[PDB]
Symmetry: D2
Amino acid sequence: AKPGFTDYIVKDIALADFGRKEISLAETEMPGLMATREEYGPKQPLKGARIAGSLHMTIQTAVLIETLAALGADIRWVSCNIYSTQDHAAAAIAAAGIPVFAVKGETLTEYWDYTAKLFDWHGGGTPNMILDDGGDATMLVHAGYRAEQGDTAFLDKPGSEEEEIFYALVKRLLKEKPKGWFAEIAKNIKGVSEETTTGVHRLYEMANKGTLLFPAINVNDSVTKSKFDNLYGCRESLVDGIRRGTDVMLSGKVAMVAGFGDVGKGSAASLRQAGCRVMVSEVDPICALQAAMEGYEVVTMEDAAPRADIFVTATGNKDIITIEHMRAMKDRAIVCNIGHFDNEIQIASLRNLKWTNIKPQVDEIEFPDKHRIIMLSEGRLVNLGNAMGHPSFVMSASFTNQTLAQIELFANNKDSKYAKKVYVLPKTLDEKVARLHLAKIGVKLTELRKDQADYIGVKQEGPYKSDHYRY
Amino acid sequence: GFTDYIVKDIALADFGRKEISLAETEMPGLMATREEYGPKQPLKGARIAGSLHMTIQTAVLIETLAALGADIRWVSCNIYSTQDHAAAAIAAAGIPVFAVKGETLTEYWDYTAKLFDWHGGGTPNMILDDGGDATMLVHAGYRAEQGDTAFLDKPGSEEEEIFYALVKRLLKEKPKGWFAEIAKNIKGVSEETTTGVHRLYEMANKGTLLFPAINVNDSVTKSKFDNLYGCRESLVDGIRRGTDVMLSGKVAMVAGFGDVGKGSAASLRQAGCRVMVSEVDPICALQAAMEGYEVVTMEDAAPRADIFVTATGNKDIITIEHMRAMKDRAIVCNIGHFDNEIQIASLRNLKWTNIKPQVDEIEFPDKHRIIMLSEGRLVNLGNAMGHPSFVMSASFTNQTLAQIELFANNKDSKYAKKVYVLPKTLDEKVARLHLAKIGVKLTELRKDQADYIGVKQEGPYKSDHYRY
Amino acid sequence: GFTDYIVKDIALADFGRKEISLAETEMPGLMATREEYGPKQPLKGARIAGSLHMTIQTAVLIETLAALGADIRWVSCNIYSTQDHAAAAIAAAGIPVFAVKGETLTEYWDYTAKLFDWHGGGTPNMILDDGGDATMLVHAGYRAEQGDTAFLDKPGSEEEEIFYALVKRLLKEKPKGWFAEIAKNIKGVSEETTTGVHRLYEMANKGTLLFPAINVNDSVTKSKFDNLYGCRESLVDGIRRGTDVMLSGKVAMVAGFGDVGKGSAASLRQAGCRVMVSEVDPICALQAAMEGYEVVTMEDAAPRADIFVTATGNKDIITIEHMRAMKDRAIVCNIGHFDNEIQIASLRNLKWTNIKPQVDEIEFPDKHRIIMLSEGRLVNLGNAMGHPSFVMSASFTNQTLAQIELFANNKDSKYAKKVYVLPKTLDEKVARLHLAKIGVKLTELRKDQADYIGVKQEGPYKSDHYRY
Amino acid sequence: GFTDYIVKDIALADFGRKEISLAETEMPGLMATREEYGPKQPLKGARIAGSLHMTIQTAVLIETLAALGADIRWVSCNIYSTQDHAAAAIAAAGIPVFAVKGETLTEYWDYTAKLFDWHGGGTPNMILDDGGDATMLVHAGYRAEQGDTAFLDKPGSEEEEIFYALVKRLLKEKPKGWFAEIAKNIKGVSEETTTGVHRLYEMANKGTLLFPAINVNDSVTKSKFDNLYGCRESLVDGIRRGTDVMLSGKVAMVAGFGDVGKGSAASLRQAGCRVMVSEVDPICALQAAMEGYEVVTMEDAAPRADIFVTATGNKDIITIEHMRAMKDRAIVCNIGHFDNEIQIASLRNLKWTNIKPQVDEIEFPDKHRIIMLSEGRLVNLGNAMGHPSFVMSASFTNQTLAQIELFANNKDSKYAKKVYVLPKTLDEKVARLHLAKIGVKLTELRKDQADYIGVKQEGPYKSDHYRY
Ligand SMILES: NC(=O)c1ccc[n+]([C@@H]2O[C@H](COP(=O)([O-])OP(=O)(O)OC[C@H]3O[C@@H](n4cnc5c(N)ncnc54)[C@H](O)[C@@H]3O)[C@@H](O)[C@H]2O)c1
Ligand SMILES: NC(=O)c1ccc[n+]([C@@H]2O[C@H](COP(=O)([O-])OP(=O)(O)OC[C@H]3O[C@@H](n4cnc5c(N)ncnc54)[C@H](O)[C@@H]3O)[C@@H](O)[C@H]2O)c1
Ligand SMILES: NC(=O)c1ccc[n+]([C@@H]2O[C@H](COP(=O)([O-])OP(=O)(O)OC[C@H]3O[C@@H](n4cnc5c(N)ncnc54)[C@H](O)[C@@H]3O)[C@@H](O)[C@H]2O)c1
Ligand SMILES: Nc1ncnc2c1ncn2[C@@H]1O[C@H](CO)[C@@H](O)[C@H]1O
Ligand SMILES: Nc1ncnc2c1ncn2[C@@H]1O[C@H](CO)[C@@H](O)[C@H]1O
Ligand code: NA
Ligand code: NA
Ligand code: NA
């Protein structure tokens, strides 16, 4: 009746003006995305692309969405986490006429219903590109394909609440959609670009077994993503989530970080810089040695559980903090997860205990002996759930990579240089991403003279480092 | 059946109570003070008028004062610092409080006057003050009441206009001699902050101070923890919540390198900023340089920093000429006092656009914009939640001990109409109360070791001139 | 013909002069003091006996006093802290100096007595002291000369025995009344360090202080710079030169968190160690915890830490029982005072093996070993070069102004036989003299801004109770 | 009766042996390798010719190889880095070593040749090379001996003239076919430097590499310690020992933000400097900016900085134009490539004044001066002691494992005449061996956790593309 366009689901469409104000502020902080718009504008490399996006529906993501649209893309979007949407960013995208299905605090049932909506393209048909963060859109396609080719038995063996919902979803879509719908989608998708370490792992798995249905670009392992987003982004946004959720004094507290890869390194720095004394656990002896060389005590979770005030899982692995650990923690210890999903902490094992909600994404859990723990975002990503995720400037680097990966797969694969395997962007594009961000922060880069470039075996314009260089 | 309050939304009270419970665990000094003094009820008969940021941390202080026997009325000391769920919890507990986040300046001063209309009639007999506004209202009313009225016709500020209007109104609507009645009944004031304490010493020096005062700011366990470590935690929190900018890669400028300036510069450098500092005091300037900060003037910094913070307690630090020279979408804020460290009033003929509560974008004729936080009032309290509970436990344990001193320990008039600080034995006790919660194990001196350095095993361990 | 000196190798004098010239550029406070006061000759007629670490930095101080007109005799105040090339340069410039790195305790006390036999006859009329040893010789000799001699037969350490033997030999050899003659002629003493100042305040309280004293340690520009930032730079320098250990990944324990312990902990933490702290003072312990250090007892640290540093000014901090529990090749050192923070004397019958100067390996019957630096005496001066020149410029400018105060500005006897500190105007001036060299640009208050915070534009900017 | 060595002074052996013992405790990777492989004697029958900086740390590596069964002859790979007491201790243990600190280029090359006159006759069968000089000698002599001699005449530099004359001399004084005899007997070379590995790949791509090679430069544990952590430990050490300047308050410029530059900037910032950086690589520049460093050109830095450090591996980084613009007594040094980062030769007509070994003052016609460390050579090895033992234990454990791989694990010819890297499980093993000494407790994965992230419980834990 009142709006002509309603092919979207947002919490409050009246937040759109506020969203637009914050998007305009983020654009100033995202020079790489804005420069990418100017450069690729005239040529419309994404004209004819139908991008299904599954990525935290934040203000930063809204700038990415509008960059893809400025390059010619038709778009449908969902968040990849039930607590990470910023409702004013989702309202601004809906108000711009782009189908988005994203609400902060949506349920798991809604989450998966919304993901399925990516694939009913407005006007008929399917997407032809996927932009993924964590692999959930990619997984819907592959599980439904597997089931539709006749291997349905896995849909009846659910191991968790979200598995049950997911398996229910695939069953319902095989019941309601035209026969062969998943192979139709599969044949139409020209590529997937994937943002995060866990999603990328799921892809290399499928690619090794030969089950990956379309080419993929691993955006996580761009240098200007993994060594910036994963590291500096968490260094800024982990303590932001903990402060907004709890308002605790960090000076004087002991924090335990599980994992010392890129996210754990950034998370331990976030906490140490804020005043905590940080301990770390690791299974990888190189990463453990790095933590020790940075001055962190390296201990087991059993050693840390009776002692630390704050626990952060940063592993991408499962069953890091168990009910046994939480039974041993001090009263009102804080527990949260910056890694993945909701199984780094054994949330499901806590569900027979008394939970008291304090405020959105903050709960107090009471044990039989009366000691309590404070749980943030029910064990899901604390920086996006309890605060606002990474700040715009570092997401500009991640999302310039995403945009260039979408151009590669959609526009620069006319010769099948990308087969049904996982690829990374070339170093010349990685360097270009960094170069686009230097002016905003006042870096003055030195130029090699020809004799200096020759001396070290590089061209003046780069690339400056071998493909094996680790930075 | 209780109605004697003004808060934004009383339905927030349950949320407030839950966060107050969480804060109690983080406030061992206040909680131990309830246990030690609760049996003796040292504040029985006290009528405490409090003017202090109506936060969750202040709620724990109010309820400690009440556990010690005090009758209480409360207001916030800043128009943006109230936490509305804290205020609602205090109202729901039957305690008169008049505190709304984003209240107007007229509401602010009218609420302050409501402190002195005690429920049941009469006046308070204690003041607990942060920034001296409640104290100033009594003294200015007293002065006018005595017949020195001309200063009321000479406001140099809009808020001065509101404040003199209020005094004029109370002179007409309250009985003859009401300010002298309040002055004679106030047994003492304890004041929390550097600016308020300076105004106290200056009244005491001129002979105009009407009742005894304890300078709580200069407790070691206040000035060297709250002003330093508090701002180190809460400054960047206010900036992040207001703006969500990446601090790594940004240049920030901090005016002042006293206690708050030291904590502020640390807040920003620890968050990844490259930090520059201004100072007028060569000792503080040399401290900043030895800590690795570049020390520059505001004129030097104005065209190039991304973030500006005033931390001086002084006026006219960031001017319209500075702001005209700033880069587009520079962030400006104040963590010191009042709203005149930045020349906010000089901006009010420019285009302001509200982004969200306590965040505005100000556009200049040449189209460059600046981002102003909390309309240039305290950014940590206005844009976030102020200092965290643990460090406020130390400040507020000092406040509670100061209230006990003035109301219960002045039977021999040891406190005259002068400004006093608490003794080092109490300062050391406040520290000691916080050690167990954070796992500190203290060493005990043996007697011959205590003798060798000339202290008693139980302290005090330092001379009164020691600077820590 | 001039040989009224004792140095290790007079051939080091050219090298010493080269490093003195380099240090002058790094010491703008002292050089500016020469420039201002040289032509006024305020120390003309002064005969200054100095007992202070005979380093390159002290040589710039000695030549500053000489440039102000002083006649001088000098000794080091520590047996391991002399830099032999600095001593050789001072001897080459014709100033009596008695200082060798590695001199014995016997020589150390014989050299101190040489201060008082002034060349050309007579005694000194000023003392510049670091640690109080020259001052103590005078007071012990005077006490014994006034009849009270029994204490001389009751030493409780080998160094006391050497000291008491010296006093006895002086009373035997020198003209009757010699100590009273010295005491009558000394117009003042200025004292550099925490321990020395504590001894002076004690004597003042007991009425035994023989002449006026200035406590130079408690200038802000000494205690909050030298004690803090000097140790932050020179502690880890001493440990690295002594041991060359990698510090990243090691656990270190610092006893004390006053000014020297704060700087020491920072030195180790900035170098990559995980640092623990002990304290007896709850305020300093809370500071350590708020700065992120674990606060533990020495008993908890002893089996765990790789590196131990005493920073207390107190005795018996690291005992034989602690060292028995330490892991093999743990490193032990002292940055505080004398050699009794660590129980070195209880180690004397274990097997010691010298590694190199000021580095020894001590082995226990169970075969674990510890690495001892400078035999438990000041590690930053014994194993490396002491504090760098720039921070010593602030300390030594203070010392120079104190000699001026006592020698040239006591015509009205404003300084009685008590302990005084320099005024804040001089403290501020010291800092101001150091700003240009490190590129600090100070802001100047406008008149209305000064009036607003209640200061003069020229300072002082802070109250006398300000703690910085 | 042992005489097969050339060192400065065999009497230094006892001091060297004391320091080797102390380093062993700090090199748990090498000592644990002795424990694990000692019983198996994997290097029995190995004749290892080593060319690696002859320091105390390298002595521990030499005795580790011997502990595994190896016969050994050794030389330094650099004329300046030899520690004469380390060389003496090795000669005194009966191991042929030819290494004197400060030897001529001619001696450097003749000593390298002596690696190949094996005691008892015959040749080495293993090379442990650091920079590729020993490998280059074999390959050039082989090339000449096959009849391609034209290159031996027509050299460029003086070092090339020395090298070519050495090849000519060996072709006369050694049997016909000597170089081909050596080539056929070498079972492998391990090499850890960039330039050495570049030479090996270049020869492998051209088919001219004569035997298998392991590139230890590729190792994660070698690369992070030898480049990042080692320089973070030893840069400021070299600067302090050379100059004793206060770092707090100073501005430093680091050219390069690769691994050595990252470690150097951190070294200086942690010690108190405010650090600026230059870079040509936008990714490395952005890293530096995100870590809070100002990124500028050398032209911008030249008039401003107090200290300059070159860390690029490139040439002509600091030029005469830059040094003309520097402030008086700025400090200049190099931690990057062995020479040519600073234009030293352009200073040769200025007045140079030696201050002490490896410290010189250079005076410009306008009388401003700069302080040059180690004549532009490596400041950490030249002015101090290089990387600490624990750092070198990581790189040297890698070398030991590579020697084991080539000598003992090539029965199936899995290594042909190409360049290989150690597999990630041996890189992980290097780290594993260092964990117990520094108190790390590693978590073990359960099988379902290992499965979930796609790894075996025993590793490797990361893909070969992982950057750490
Ligand atoms: N927001 C908070 O939570 C919080 C906490 C404590 C105190 N405060 C307030 O912060 C302000 C500062 O308090 P403080 O304890 O740090 O005081 P302080 O005296 O220790 O420090 C103020 C510093 O400002 C410097 N200064 C004065 N005018 C200057 C100018 N024009 N330019 C540069 N520097 C100048 C002074 O030299 C001084 O060192 C006060 O108003 C105080 O009440 C706020
Ligand atoms: N080596 C140097 O270059 C250098 C520089 C300045 C001062 N000093 C000397 O360092 C010593 C300390 O000086 P300071 O200025 O830091 O004094 P301080 O009073 O500021 O601090 C000493 C601290 O030691 C603590 N303490 C006392 N006994 C203790 C114990 N048994 N265990 C743990 N802590 C204990 C005190 O509580 C105190 O906080 C003095 O001897 C001083 O003369 C040395
Ligand atoms: N002193 C030591 O003990 C020690 C230890 C390890 C390595 N090194 C040597 O240090 C050098 C650097 O090693 P690295 O591992 O850091 O190499 P790297 O390749 O990781 O870093 C070199 C950096 O220099 C930058 N660069 C090149 N030319 C430049 C210029 N004109 N201006 C500014 N930046 C420039 C490059 O972009 C690169 O990021 C090599 O010569 C290496 O062998 C010395
Ligand atoms: N503000 C944000 N907006 C969008 N994505 C974000 C934000 N913060 C972190 N992320 C992304 O979330 C991923 C984790 O699911 C990370 O790979 C990171 O790139
Ligand atoms: N390089 C130095 N030269 C002279 N005195 C020093 C040096 N380093 C530290 N000191 C002084 O030694 C005192 C301790 O005896 C400290 O108070 C300090 O001022
Ligand atoms: Na954000
Ligand atoms: Na708070
Ligand atoms: Na020195």
